[PDB]
Amino acid sequence: LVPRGSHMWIGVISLFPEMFKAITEFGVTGRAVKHNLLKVECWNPRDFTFDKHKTVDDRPYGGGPGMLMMVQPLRDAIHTAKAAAGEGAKVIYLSPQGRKLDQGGVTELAQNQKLILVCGRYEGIDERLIQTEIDEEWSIGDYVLTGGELPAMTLIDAVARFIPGVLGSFADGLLDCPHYTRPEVLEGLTVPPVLMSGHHEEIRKWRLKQSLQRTWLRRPELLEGLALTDEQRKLLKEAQAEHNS
Amino acid sequence: LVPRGSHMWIGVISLFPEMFKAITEFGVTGRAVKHNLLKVECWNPRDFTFDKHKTVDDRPYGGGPGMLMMVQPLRDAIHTAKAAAGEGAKVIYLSPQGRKLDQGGVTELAQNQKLILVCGRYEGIDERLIQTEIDEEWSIGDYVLTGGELPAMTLIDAVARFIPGVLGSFADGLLDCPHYTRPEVLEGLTVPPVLMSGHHEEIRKWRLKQSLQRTWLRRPELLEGLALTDEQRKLLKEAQAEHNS
Ligand SMILES: NC(=O)c1ccc(NC2CCCC2)nc1
Numbered sequence: 001l002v003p004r005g006s007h008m009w010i011g012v013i014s015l016f017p018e019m020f021k022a023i024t025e026f027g028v029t030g031r032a033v034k035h036n037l038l039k040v041e042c043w044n045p046r047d048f049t050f051d052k053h054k055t056v057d058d059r060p061y062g063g064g065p066g067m068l069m070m071v072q073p074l075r076d077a078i079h080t081a082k083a084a085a086g087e088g089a090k091v092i093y094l095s096p097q098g099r100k101l102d103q104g105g106v107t108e109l110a111q112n113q114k115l116i117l118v119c120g121r122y123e124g125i126d127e128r129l130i131q132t133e134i135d136e137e138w139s140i141g142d143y144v145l146t147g148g149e150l151p152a153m154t155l156i157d158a159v160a161r162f163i164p165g166v167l168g169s170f171a172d173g174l175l176d177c178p179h180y181t182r183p184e185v186l187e188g189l190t191v192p193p194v195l196m197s198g199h200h201e202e203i204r205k206w207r208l209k210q211s212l213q214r215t216w217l218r219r220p221e222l223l224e225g226l227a228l229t230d231e232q233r234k235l236l237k238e239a240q241a242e243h244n245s
Numbered sequence: 246l247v248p249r250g251s252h253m254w255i256g257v258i259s260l261f262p263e264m265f266k267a268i269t270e271f272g273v274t275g276r277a278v279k280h281n282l283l284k285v286e287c288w289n290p291r292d293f294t295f296d297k298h299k300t301v302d303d304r305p306y307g308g309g310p311g312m313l314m315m316v317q318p319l320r321d322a323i324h325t326a327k328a329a330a331g332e333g334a335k336v337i338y339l340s341p342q343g344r345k346l347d348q349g350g351v352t353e354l355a356q357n358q359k360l361i362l363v364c365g366r367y368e369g370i371d372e373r374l375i376q377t378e379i380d381e382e383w384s385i386g387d388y389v390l391t392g393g394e395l396p397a398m399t400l401i402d403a404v405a406r407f408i409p410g411v412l413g414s415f416a417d418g419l420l421d422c423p424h425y426t427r428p429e430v431l432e433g434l435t436v437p438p439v440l441m442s443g444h445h446e447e448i449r450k451w452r453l454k455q456s457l458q459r460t461w462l463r464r465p466e467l468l469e470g471l472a473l474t475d476e477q478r479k480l481l482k483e484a485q486a487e488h489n490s
């Protein structure tokens with residue numbers, strides 16, 4: 001049986017729980033679920049309604065367009081998820097008003113053995129539920145979506161990569177280097193000879209230099225956040241001189 | 246029949262095309278697909294393999310861990326999608342090395358009637374395919390995922406909101422205001438009386454003031470990017486004075 005010491009449980013509150021098949025049935029995350037490294041358990045506010053038409057939205061006070069999620073079914077779904085999780089589960093709401101997710105934030109979230117993710121729909125949820133039920137608000141980026149399910153799945157995928165057993169250049173805060181595979185020549189473009197050389201140290205340094213160059217050209221602000229090693233300073237200076245020559 | 250003037254077509258290249266049911270079968274985006282406002286068409290590199298085991302990965306030159314997507318099946322899938330799209334389709338690769346997506350970038354991407362989204366798996370794709378097949382590289386945020394499918398779906402959801410007919414505070418670059426619905430009192434927390442007043446102008450100003458205050462407290466850098474109106478300057482100064490009193 002598969003070693004699952006640091007397994008993670010994620011409860012999800014969603015009006016569309018079948019969306020989560022996209023991560024629980026496919027690829028690396030699908031394998032993680034099958035092997036009990038990751039468990040994703042969903043509760044649907046619709047199931048906590050009592051009226052004949054299973055109403056899950058409600059009108060905002062102060063008017064204006066759009067609906068909000070109805071409080072009672074959503075609150076009851078959240079409470080049921082909390083009771084299942086037991087002690088220690090952090091409840092997260094996904095929205096553009098939340099803390100912006102980045103890889104550092106992913107590594108922080110990955111320290112939790114249990115998370116509950118609340119997925120908003122319509123124009124969102126009652127502010128007082130954020131006050132009374134939510135521990136942390138997070139955003140996956142500065143854009144607006146129709147639902148919090150894709151943000152929740154994005155978060156789950158990102159943190160799952162840190163669960164031991166789930167995997168077979170962002171680690172040092174740099175963009176990735178270019179990668180090449182067969183064929184050796186593709187529409188006249190050749191693989192850099194260093195990658196064919198079998199010189200492991202030259203390859204390492206080429207890849208690091210490329211990561212530094214790419215970060216400098218595309219995302220220079222990311223370099224400001226780093227304390228570069230002597231080697232990294234040298235390779236970046238080399239890259240900048242070559243770019244400039 | 247449903248007015249579909251500015252309909253959008255999105256071609257997707259993915260080893261897991263069934264993931265896209267999460268947006269094509271549910272909610273607002275699901276309705277958009279059913280009503281022909283949005284079309285999502287998928288091609289799977291696996292279908293373009295010729296060997297007995299339908300191999301879709303390949304070893305990176307220069308070694309190191311991980312595999313890349315195999316060039317020939319992926320390239321052939323991309324070419325097939327391009328031929329289906331005909332003239333004018335922008336081909337996008339999703340990766341952390343791409344231009345960071347924000348709502349302005351969403352509105353730019355939404356001007357395209359046709360997009361093709363290439364979803365990487367494994368450690369990614371050959372750099373020369375980016376050179377020869379990809380028009381633009383985009384990132385949904387500074388974090389690493391197991392696949393480009395969730396980024397692609399995130400992009401599709403975000404741009405779909407701009408298609409006329411798909412919908413029933415980021416517009417001015419501010420965070421959203423708090424929203425309230427029934428009941429009037431929730432765990433001792435009351436709805437702000439202004440929202441019950443029926444005074445449309447006071448409600449508008451309260452909501453705007455809240456958006457300004459929330460943006461200032463949580464995301465002050467976002468204010469630097471705005472040219473505030475006289476009213477917005479006044480309401481922000483009011484909010485800051487109250488916070489400080
Ligand atoms: N950028 C984000 O992380 C994000 C989260 C939720 C969302 N929409 C939800 C929240 C309110 C109702 C739909 N859009 C965007």
Ligand SMILES: NC(=O)c1ccc(NC2CCCC2)nc1
Nearest residue numbers: 339340365369384385390392393
């Ligand atoms: N932040 C992003 O937009 C993003 C895109 C693709 C991805 N992973 C893919 C790309 C390389 C192979 C898997 N991770 C993250």
